[PDB]
């Protein structure tokens, strides 16, 4: 089906005979494309070396929240770390965190009983989740939890427990009997990373190297974790200085600002299903003509990527 | 005193370019044809509620209005956002301030940042703990009132400060007039032109 | 021909030269042939 | 005054549904001939104008 | 439109998720965008 | 017991009990990359 326009037509029709006519053809042509990557120029490393190694994490009635910002974020080191007994993620899958890139990231951290780790999931119901650490039902983030029975047990009744991300302080306040001989009654340390995916400028971005920028070819791009397959072309769109991206009538992305050089690129999809094949019957000839729908003839090799065909 | 704000107090809802399109958006907006409380800075700066958010404007020839305060108790029990322009640049803090009995500018801490004939318009909102500021400036030729016409306020700065704000006050240079209105959850239809600029709106 | 007009997206935003697979094909008879 | 024709639209249903994603296009093949019969219907409408 | 997916943008789902969950989120967009096209083509056939 | 395969393969090995979490089709982690990854469309049983 990728051989020639008549083969693309025979495969569009699911037929070896083609009757006389003009046929608007489904794509089938081979689509090689090169990756392109872009992120802001920044050199700080994110403080996970503080957050995951602090001498004591907080009690889960009054958990502590750390803002991560303005840094390169090696989530691959966290995900490779032997320290973590479980590493859930929701709205993101952890392998993608090194390609992905965020405005801020919030780490919430505390100690709980090991059986309570199952309650740290989106919109959960239970005697910790419904009372002092509720996650949103639309939470986008990772939950990282491990037994700390070597660190935090003594038991160690200095560890205590009592809406989404709410904090509150007679009180229902209670203590944990953390002793080394306790399997579910162990202390577990936990960190919860919440990702701020808003369309404002990103500041917390994975250690993935920005490529050179390729215009006028079909590329598999990434700008600040916004990906796509498309041709990039520099454009005359008058972005106001606060605007980072541009959208079509469909609200699909039509343009982007490069984060390293503040030029505006239009995006165009590579496919070009705008091909029609003019044929006499295959009983008359295998000769065809091709109509490239509403393109200028000098632009045809660029419209169809004829060097890759 | 009061005055009726016309089509004023509209702002760019997101950091996205759109052009030659009509876009429906739901957000905290100042309603059209709505009463804003009017105060002279010459011949006061009382405390106001913040409600869901604030539209603030000043009509000027003098730069007497120079800053703002936001918080809950405003008495060092908790963080309070202080914003001042020092006549060279903007300076911002969220410290546990113990403010004066009648605050003015002379002619613990966490977050900090550093950067009638005219009308200066600003919007303050505090969604998800992000204190978002929007801005616009224009010439005018009226001492009494806001102009009957449209211009969209564009982002000044965004601060990830997390304060549970419920109260507000302005700051004046002492040894001009200003207007306060409250934002409300509203659907607006916005008219983005070829230059990606919001040129009109429907409440 | 002046009394019928376009103001649509599109239709006019495409026809005045959108790329989400949608296209407008020309009629076979041009208005000069009609 | 009488209507005689309407605008001959064509929608590339793979680029509408899947927007140049190969991952989506492989999932859209599991729906079989829905996409080719949408293109067939709009082609019949367009030729009829 | 989302059609019940985490995002209406097909490239968000592909840049955020791995294949076992990305295919569940994309299938909501495929189902709703295919229903959106079937609704358009049906009403264009009746209008034609 | 009602079913009849062309071949069956038993993959037999030892790991630490905490890492048994990683032996599933959609899973990821150091077992599920550097030494033993299942297909994301795997048909079969995991016994541990």
XYZ file of C-alpha atoms in Angstrom:
691
model
C 0.000 0.000 0.000
C 3.009 2.349 0.401
C 4.432 1.553 -3.089
C 2.636 4.079 -5.342
C -0.684 6.048 -5.596
C -2.499 3.179 -7.367
C -1.495 0.768 -4.532
C -2.662 3.333 -1.941
C -5.977 3.419 -3.930
C -6.318 -0.421 -4.128
C -5.717 -0.547 -0.335
C -8.217 2.335 0.281
C -10.859 0.372 -1.711
C -9.814 -3.124 -0.387
C -9.824 -4.149 -4.092
C -7.310 -5.351 -6.753
C -9.432 -4.015 -9.658
C -9.976 -0.224 -9.527
C -12.870 1.130 -11.629
C -12.486 4.422 -13.604
C -12.807 7.534 -11.378
C -11.125 9.871 -8.863
C -10.501 8.302 -5.419
C -9.717 10.224 -2.209
C -7.097 7.890 -0.637
C -6.404 6.880 2.993
C -2.746 7.502 3.913
C -0.691 4.170 4.030
C 2.617 6.010 3.045
C 5.697 5.340 5.247
C 6.135 7.966 8.039
C 9.763 8.165 9.349
C 10.164 11.149 11.752
C 12.949 12.471 14.056
C 12.465 13.519 17.713
C 12.998 17.153 18.874
C 13.178 18.301 22.544
C 13.036 21.772 24.196
C 13.050 22.994 27.858
C 14.034 26.288 29.621
C 17.789 26.805 30.259
C 18.159 26.048 34.031
C 20.863 24.282 36.138
C 19.549 23.848 39.742
C 18.736 20.236 40.851
C 15.454 19.687 42.772
C 15.697 19.202 46.624
C 14.507 15.525 46.733
C 17.854 14.869 48.524
C 16.309 16.923 51.406
C 12.644 15.746 51.232
C 13.323 11.964 51.157
C 16.236 12.039 53.734
C 15.033 14.459 56.508
C 15.745 13.298 60.131
C 11.985 13.090 60.995
C 8.963 13.420 58.696
C 5.844 15.047 60.270
C 2.904 13.399 62.098
C -0.012 12.723 59.658
C -2.451 15.038 61.566
C -0.223 18.049 60.558
C 1.818 16.883 57.513
C 4.414 19.265 55.955
C 4.218 20.620 52.355
C 7.398 21.519 50.371
C 7.228 23.519 47.096
C 9.646 22.268 44.401
C 10.315 24.898 41.668
C 12.989 26.395 39.323
C 14.956 23.095 39.007
C 15.881 20.017 36.925
C 13.963 17.082 38.435
C 15.614 13.607 38.373
C 12.530 11.442 39.050
C 14.460 8.520 37.445
C 16.837 8.457 40.492
C 13.784 8.322 42.825
C 12.158 5.557 40.714
C 15.430 3.503 40.623
C 15.950 3.964 44.431
C 15.852 0.740 46.534
C 14.407 2.797 49.476
C 10.739 2.645 48.316
C 8.419 -0.331 49.096
C 5.634 1.075 46.835
C 5.599 3.882 44.207
C 2.036 4.548 42.910
C 1.262 7.272 40.339
C -2.098 8.669 39.116
C -2.735 10.818 35.961
C 1.010 10.225 35.146
C 3.038 6.975 34.765
C 6.500 7.242 36.457
C 8.633 6.362 33.355
C 7.305 9.556 31.602
C 8.381 11.931 34.470
C 11.845 12.472 32.876
C 10.254 13.619 29.510
C 7.449 15.599 31.269
C 7.735 19.131 32.794
C 5.620 21.130 35.315
C 5.020 24.659 36.722
C 5.578 23.616 40.375
C 5.574 20.276 42.229
C 4.384 19.901 45.842
C 5.773 17.228 48.173
C 3.540 16.378 51.186
C 5.355 14.156 53.751
C 4.630 12.313 57.020
C 4.671 8.904 58.863
C 1.691 6.456 59.061
C 1.047 2.815 60.101
C 1.904 0.492 57.149
C -1.719 -0.721 56.711
C -2.767 2.953 56.119
C -0.618 3.284 52.887
C -3.566 1.757 50.888
C -5.661 4.832 51.897
C -3.251 7.235 50.050
C -5.053 7.134 46.657
C -7.442 9.495 44.721
C -10.733 10.170 46.612
C -10.131 7.277 49.128
C -12.353 6.280 52.127
C -10.722 5.299 55.484
C -9.689 6.423 59.036
C -6.712 8.527 57.717
C -7.894 9.514 54.203
C -11.415 10.704 55.194
C -10.179 12.450 58.414
C -6.677 14.073 57.965
C -5.001 13.306 54.541
C -7.616 13.332 51.722
C -6.325 13.204 48.117
C -8.481 14.686 45.283
C -10.486 12.181 43.168
C -8.783 13.887 40.129
C -5.299 13.859 41.802
C -2.310 13.932 39.383
C 0.828 12.856 41.219
C 2.898 10.012 42.747
C 2.652 8.329 46.208
C 5.965 6.935 47.489
C 5.881 4.828 50.699
C 8.219 2.509 52.666
C 8.619 0.810 56.063
C 10.699 3.019 58.444
C 10.756 0.484 61.344
C 14.593 0.828 61.582
C 14.383 4.701 61.738
C 11.189 5.661 63.619
C 10.300 2.766 66.025
C 11.549 2.798 69.692
C 6.746 2.572 71.232
C 7.424 5.963 69.579
C 4.102 7.613 70.670
C 5.577 11.020 69.586
C 4.096 10.065 66.160
C 0.394 11.062 66.038
C -2.788 10.898 63.878
C -6.182 12.714 64.188
C -11.521 17.832 52.184
C -8.757 17.268 49.519
C -5.392 18.674 50.817
C -7.119 20.207 53.941
C -5.112 20.804 57.207
C -6.679 21.024 60.713
C -5.521 20.963 64.401
C -10.698 18.182 73.131
C -9.295 16.906 69.789
C -9.527 13.393 68.103
C -5.663 13.244 68.377
C -4.151 9.734 68.921
C -0.633 8.116 68.963
C 1.201 5.217 67.219
C 2.771 2.292 69.193
C 5.810 2.007 66.844
C 8.145 -0.767 68.184
C 10.730 -2.800 66.130
C 8.909 -6.154 66.821
C 5.557 -4.912 65.315
C 4.034 -6.662 59.841
C 1.365 -3.960 59.157
C 1.835 -2.200 62.569
C 5.297 -0.902 61.463
C 5.831 2.829 60.841
C 5.866 3.670 57.134
C 7.425 6.896 55.844
C 5.649 8.472 52.863
C 6.063 11.327 50.376
C 3.277 12.417 48.006
C 4.299 14.433 44.912
C 1.504 16.560 43.356
C 2.223 17.891 39.831
C 1.038 21.407 38.776
C 0.356 20.849 35.027
C -1.067 24.389 34.366
C -0.298 26.099 30.997
C 1.808 28.856 32.656
C 5.663 28.659 32.208
C 7.119 25.345 33.459
C 9.894 25.385 36.156
C 10.236 21.688 37.291
C 11.456 19.635 34.314
C 13.124 16.222 33.827
C 16.883 15.716 33.036
C 16.315 15.188 29.266
C 18.691 17.112 26.942
C 17.188 19.730 24.600
C 18.024 18.990 20.928
C 18.726 21.500 18.183
C 15.481 22.891 16.629
C 14.372 21.477 13.217
C 11.976 23.562 11.060
C 10.269 22.579 7.756
C 10.448 18.744 8.389
C 8.045 16.297 10.070
C 9.321 15.937 13.707
C 8.188 14.200 16.922
C 8.564 17.283 19.166
C 8.506 18.126 22.921
C 8.404 21.757 24.236
C 8.167 21.957 28.087
C 6.592 18.423 28.064
C 3.973 19.477 25.419
C 4.564 16.823 22.706
C 3.239 16.066 19.217
C 4.090 14.852 15.703
C 4.156 17.726 13.199
C 6.037 20.082 10.900
C 7.376 23.155 12.752
C 7.461 26.478 10.823
C 8.365 29.902 12.294
C 5.299 32.205 12.123
C 3.937 35.773 12.182
C 1.363 35.163 15.020
C 1.455 38.235 17.344
C 1.728 36.444 20.733
C 1.349 38.827 23.705
C 4.472 38.467 25.976
C 2.712 36.329 28.667
C 1.359 33.738 26.116
C 3.376 30.448 25.869
C 1.190 28.370 23.438
C -1.470 29.016 20.733
C -4.759 27.173 19.934
C -6.989 26.479 16.901
C -10.839 26.881 16.782
C -10.796 23.183 17.920
C -8.745 24.284 21.015
C -5.939 21.930 19.702
C -2.389 23.461 19.777
C -1.726 25.456 16.556
C 1.529 27.202 17.633
C 4.209 27.226 20.407
C 6.918 29.544 21.768
C 10.384 27.937 21.991
C 11.519 28.174 25.712
C 15.231 28.906 24.846
C 14.741 31.253 21.846
C 11.454 33.205 22.211
C 10.372 32.722 18.537
C 6.868 31.483 17.615
C 6.462 28.233 15.651
C 3.284 27.159 13.904
C 2.629 23.392 14.128
C 1.139 21.485 11.122
C 0.256 17.708 11.163
C 2.462 15.560 8.860
C -0.223 13.125 7.568
C -1.671 14.822 4.430
C -4.725 12.610 3.746
C -5.632 15.313 1.119
C -4.569 13.004 -1.791
C -6.902 11.938 -4.621
C -5.888 9.490 -7.395
C -7.343 9.907 -10.914
C -7.428 6.563 -12.745
C -8.955 4.996 -15.838
C -9.995 1.409 -14.985
C -7.100 -0.987 -14.125
C -8.448 -2.975 -17.142
C -7.498 0.110 -19.267
C -4.186 1.143 -17.581
C -2.047 1.128 -14.392
C -1.253 4.801 -15.277
C -2.670 7.369 -12.767
C -2.605 11.092 -11.988
C -2.522 12.495 -8.414
C -4.415 15.550 -7.132
C -2.946 17.101 -3.964
C -5.969 18.891 -2.570
C -5.587 22.694 -2.374
C -1.730 22.831 -2.484
C 0.530 24.913 -4.760
C 2.632 22.706 -7.113
C 5.982 24.035 -5.742
C 4.815 22.960 -2.230
C 3.848 19.315 -3.151
C 7.246 17.739 -2.132
C 6.965 19.629 1.219
C 3.242 18.772 1.712
C 3.749 14.988 1.163
C 7.394 14.671 2.432
C 8.422 13.287 -0.984
C 12.083 12.702 0.072
C 10.822 10.199 2.744
C 8.346 8.533 0.274
C -19.939 56.508 47.375
C -20.820 54.071 44.503
C -20.573 53.995 40.702
C -21.742 51.486 38.067
C -18.783 49.749 36.331
C -19.690 49.248 32.634
C -17.796 46.547 30.595
C -14.585 47.076 32.724
C -12.681 44.444 34.795
C -12.324 41.728 32.074
C -8.940 39.943 31.854
C -7.122 37.276 29.766
C -8.360 33.989 31.382
C -5.305 31.838 30.382
C -1.692 32.210 29.049
C -2.809 30.932 25.590
C -2.880 32.769 22.249
C -6.233 32.526 20.411
C -7.074 34.702 17.380
C -10.071 35.474 15.129
C -12.391 33.515 17.520
C -15.224 33.847 20.078
C -14.280 31.879 23.230
C -16.665 31.029 26.109
C -14.935 30.844 29.527
C -16.140 30.413 33.140
C -14.045 32.196 35.808
C -14.163 34.746 38.659
C -15.079 37.969 36.728
C -16.462 41.350 37.845
C -20.076 41.335 36.455
C -21.003 43.849 33.725
C -23.014 46.982 34.718
C -22.268 46.331 38.435
C -21.739 48.695 41.380
C -18.110 49.317 42.469
C -17.539 51.203 45.750
C -15.774 54.538 45.005
C -13.270 56.223 47.392
C -11.056 59.339 47.094
C -7.379 58.859 48.071
C -7.198 62.659 48.643
C -9.424 64.376 51.316
C -8.823 57.343 52.880
C -7.836 53.607 52.936
C -10.259 51.481 55.104
C -10.182 47.631 55.354
C -12.504 45.667 52.981
C -13.518 41.981 52.734
C -11.777 40.110 49.851
C -14.770 37.792 49.075
C -13.929 35.401 46.133
C -11.558 38.067 44.654
C -11.182 41.814 43.913
C -11.128 44.185 40.960
C -9.317 47.421 41.904
C -8.860 50.589 39.821
C -7.330 54.054 40.394
C -7.871 57.273 38.407
C -4.780 59.354 38.662
C -2.452 62.304 37.908
C -0.141 62.017 40.964
C 0.767 58.376 41.934
C -0.712 58.721 45.487
C -1.997 55.079 45.510
C 1.215 52.917 45.748
C 0.379 49.514 47.348
C -1.955 46.943 48.962
C -2.294 44.539 51.952
C -4.181 41.185 52.012
C -4.764 38.515 54.712
C -7.237 37.432 57.446
C -6.323 38.954 60.884
C -3.592 41.483 59.769
C -2.011 41.292 63.297
C 1.093 38.972 63.078
C -0.899 35.768 64.055
C -0.439 34.570 60.403
C 1.145 35.517 57.006
C -0.100 38.656 55.168
C 0.619 39.660 51.559
C 2.124 43.183 51.300
C 2.581 44.725 47.800
C 4.299 48.136 47.321
C 5.766 50.042 44.371
C 8.678 52.123 45.815
C 8.594 54.568 42.799
C 11.486 52.543 41.188
C 10.092 48.937 41.191
C 7.524 46.522 42.742
C 8.460 44.767 46.036
C 6.328 41.925 47.513
C 6.417 40.040 50.881
C 4.061 37.634 52.792
C 5.522 38.065 56.319
C 3.616 37.865 59.649
C 3.404 41.710 59.757
C 2.122 43.756 62.731
C 0.578 46.617 60.668
C 0.091 50.233 61.868
C -3.222 51.615 63.282
C -3.700 53.653 60.019
C -1.196 52.306 57.376
C 0.634 54.588 54.865
C 3.914 54.983 52.878
C 6.129 58.000 53.793
C 6.580 60.756 51.127
C 8.432 35.451 60.374
C 8.599 35.446 56.514
C 8.313 32.892 53.628
C 7.659 34.206 50.056
C 9.267 37.434 48.720
C 9.571 38.944 45.185
C 11.144 42.036 43.498
C 10.723 43.258 39.863
C -7.941 62.754 36.280
C -5.707 61.892 33.250
C -4.760 58.165 33.554
C -6.569 54.988 34.738
C -4.748 51.976 36.266
C -6.784 48.731 36.557
C -5.825 45.580 38.510
C -7.426 42.219 39.413
C -6.493 40.156 42.481
C -7.601 36.500 42.884
C -6.347 33.650 45.077
C -7.442 30.362 43.377
C -5.675 27.194 44.720
C -3.323 29.448 46.795
C -1.907 31.149 43.642
C -2.257 34.912 44.116
C -2.757 36.023 40.484
C -2.428 39.690 39.497
C -3.681 41.194 36.193
C -3.102 44.785 34.977
C -3.947 47.545 32.446
C -3.165 51.284 31.975
C -4.980 53.875 29.766
C -5.402 57.670 29.372
C -8.791 59.143 30.526
C -10.499 62.609 30.692
C -12.985 62.239 33.636
C -12.467 62.884 37.412
C -15.796 61.271 38.549
C -15.979 57.827 37.015
C -14.767 54.693 35.182
C -14.965 54.943 31.325
C -17.900 53.400 29.406
C -15.790 51.083 27.172
C -13.782 47.817 26.919
C -10.109 46.871 27.472
C -8.786 43.504 28.765
C -6.379 43.334 31.750
C -3.295 41.134 31.110
C -1.158 39.120 33.605
C 1.190 41.163 35.841
C 2.582 38.326 38.065
C 1.519 35.007 39.730
C 2.604 34.211 43.344
C 2.313 30.588 44.787
C 1.814 31.969 48.344
C -0.989 29.728 49.778
C -2.575 32.369 52.149
C -6.262 31.691 53.101
C -7.140 35.412 52.366
C -10.498 36.965 53.493
C -9.593 40.734 53.954
C -7.938 43.550 51.974
C -6.623 47.181 52.295
C -4.832 49.750 49.991
C -1.715 51.920 50.751
C -1.252 55.649 50.048
C 1.766 58.005 49.954
C 1.379 60.553 52.852
C 3.460 63.090 54.879
C -6.540 60.759 43.055
C -9.431 58.267 43.536
C -9.988 54.473 43.482
C -12.722 51.852 42.991
C -13.306 48.381 44.567
C -15.482 45.578 43.100
C -15.787 41.834 43.863
C -15.241 39.050 41.311
C -17.950 36.340 40.982
C -18.083 32.905 39.222
C -19.410 34.009 35.798
C -19.496 32.748 32.198
C -18.194 35.312 29.674
C -17.942 35.051 25.855
C -14.635 36.713 24.755
C -13.837 38.211 21.276
C -10.200 37.501 20.297
C -9.200 39.502 17.157
C -6.486 38.744 14.498
C -3.790 40.233 16.839
C -4.897 37.626 19.488
C -6.258 40.512 21.615
C -9.569 40.353 23.521
C -11.524 43.276 21.965
C -15.015 42.603 23.440
C -16.967 40.400 25.901
C -20.558 39.231 26.755
C -21.503 38.613 30.428
C -23.958 37.083 -5.266
C -23.387 40.070 -2.884
C -26.530 39.202 -0.777
C -25.175 35.797 0.522
C -22.115 36.033 2.864
C -19.812 33.907 5.094
C -18.738 34.453 8.780
C -17.833 30.965 10.113
C -15.037 28.645 11.361
C -15.207 26.972 8.923
C -16.234 27.397 6.107
C -14.839 31.080 5.984
C -11.654 30.477 8.095
C -10.705 27.520 5.783
C -12.424 28.806 2.588
C -10.554 32.188 2.813
C -7.157 30.480 2.066
C -8.807 24.329 10.352
C -6.318 21.471 9.762
C -8.198 18.935 12.018
C -9.023 16.674 8.993
C -11.892 18.982 7.841
C -11.697 20.460 4.279
C -14.019 22.141 1.727
C -13.859 20.741 -1.828
C -14.645 23.093 -4.781
C -17.819 22.574 -6.884
C -17.289 20.982 -10.333
C -18.976 23.870 -12.214
C -17.308 27.217 -11.354
C -19.646 30.224 -10.793
C -18.551 31.421 -14.289
C -19.708 28.054 -15.778
C -23.018 28.297 -13.838
C -35.197 31.584 -4.591
C -34.269 27.849 -4.321
C -31.302 26.023 -2.707
C -29.584 23.684 -5.221
C -26.308 22.644 -3.572
C -24.451 22.900 -0.282
C -20.747 23.046 0.632
C -18.866 19.855 -0.396
C -17.170 19.031 2.938
C -14.586 16.250 3.275
C -13.439 15.046 6.717
C -10.349 12.847 7.008
C -11.779 10.853 9.948
C -8.361 9.407 10.958
C -6.874 12.937 11.263
C -10.053 14.236 12.990
C -10.196 11.352 15.547
C -6.435 10.668 15.992
C -4.637 13.915 14.963
C -1.425 12.294 13.522
C -0.981 9.892 16.540
C 0.126 6.372 15.459
C -0.869 5.032 18.922
C -4.462 6.245 18.486
C -4.568 5.220 14.789
C -3.770 1.584 15.785
C -6.626 1.706 18.399
C -9.000 3.232 15.774
C -8.385 0.191 13.472
C -10.033 -1.984 16.211
C -13.325 -0.176 15.368
C -13.026 -1.610 11.813
C -14.754 0.056 8.849
C -16.540 2.892 10.749
C -13.976 5.420 9.471
C -14.037 4.282 5.776
C -17.885 4.300 5.710
C -17.914 7.898 7.154
C -15.566 8.963 4.291
C -17.824 6.979 1.838
C -20.963 8.817 3.085
C -19.383 12.324 2.868
C -18.013 11.456 -0.633
C -21.562 10.472 -1.739
C -22.943 13.754 -0.276
C -20.160 15.761 -2.015
C -20.580 14.071 -5.461
C -24.355 14.600 -5.147
C -23.886 18.412 -4.847
C -14.338 17.827 24.761
C -13.003 15.194 27.211
C -15.740 12.534 26.689
C -14.666 11.326 30.196
C -10.887 11.168 29.438
C -8.309 12.926 31.725
C -7.695 15.515 28.927
C -9.255 16.425 25.558
C -5.676 16.721 24.165
C -4.516 13.364 22.738
C -0.842 14.423 23.188
C -1.360 15.020 26.980
C -2.457 11.383 27.384
C 0.519 10.162 25.291
C 3.084 12.448 27.066
C 1.787 11.645 30.626
C 0.756 7.947 30.552
C 2.217 4.504 29.737
C 0.351 2.178 27.286
C -1.924 0.153 29.697
C -3.714 3.340 30.946
C -3.089 5.565 27.871
C -5.141 3.084 25.760
C -8.073 3.395 28.270
C -7.997 7.229 28.132
C -7.553 7.335 24.307
C -10.453 4.865 23.819
C -12.794 7.461 25.507
C -11.577 10.120 23.022
C -11.895 7.652 20.073
C -15.451 6.689 21.183
C -16.587 10.328 21.650
C -14.826 11.765 18.527
C -16.183 8.862 16.420
C -19.716 9.541 17.824
C -19.136 13.288 17.087
C -18.317 12.409 13.444
C -21.241 9.906 13.130
C -23.622 12.634 14.436
C -22.257 15.149 11.876
C -22.341 12.694 8.909
C -25.881 11.487 9.828
C -27.221 15.072 9.979
C -25.349 15.987 6.723
C -27.003 12.967 4.985
C -30.464 14.119 6.194
C -29.594 17.758 5.189
C -28.267 16.571 1.785
C -8.862 -27.277 32.293
C -11.319 -26.495 29.375
C -8.478 -24.922 27.318
C -5.726 -26.215 25.010
C -2.535 -24.267 24.134
C 0.100 -24.790 21.391
C 3.054 -24.430 23.802
C 3.434 -23.354 27.452
C 6.578 -21.756 28.939
C 7.487 -21.750 32.639
C 9.840 -18.868 33.620
C 11.429 -20.006 36.945
C 13.582 -17.753 39.213
C 14.095 -16.197 42.729
C 13.611 -12.536 43.821
C 13.149 -10.609 47.120
C 9.453 -10.687 48.240
C 9.003 -6.860 47.972
C 9.911 -7.068 44.234
C 7.057 -9.591 43.447
C 4.964 -6.356 43.117
C 6.916 -5.711 39.850
C 5.998 -9.056 38.112
C 2.828 -7.953 36.240
C 2.125 -6.976 32.547
C 1.669 -3.191 33.058
C 4.291 -2.881 35.859
C 7.555 -0.874 35.860
C 10.648 -0.791 38.147
C 14.150 -2.371 38.227
C 12.990 -6.031 37.828
C 10.550 -4.863 35.107
C 13.463 -3.320 33.078
C 17.005 -4.577 33.868
C 16.231 -8.364 34.154
C 12.536 -9.529 33.771
C 9.781 -7.582 31.888
C 6.456 -9.237 30.912
C 4.632 -8.277 27.662
C 1.958 -5.576 28.239
C -0.528 -7.979 26.465
C 0.655 -11.133 28.379
C -1.698 -14.173 28.544
C -0.745 -16.658 31.271
C -0.388 -16.909 35.080
C 2.158 -15.508 37.618
C 2.674 -17.798 40.641
C 4.943 -16.780 43.572
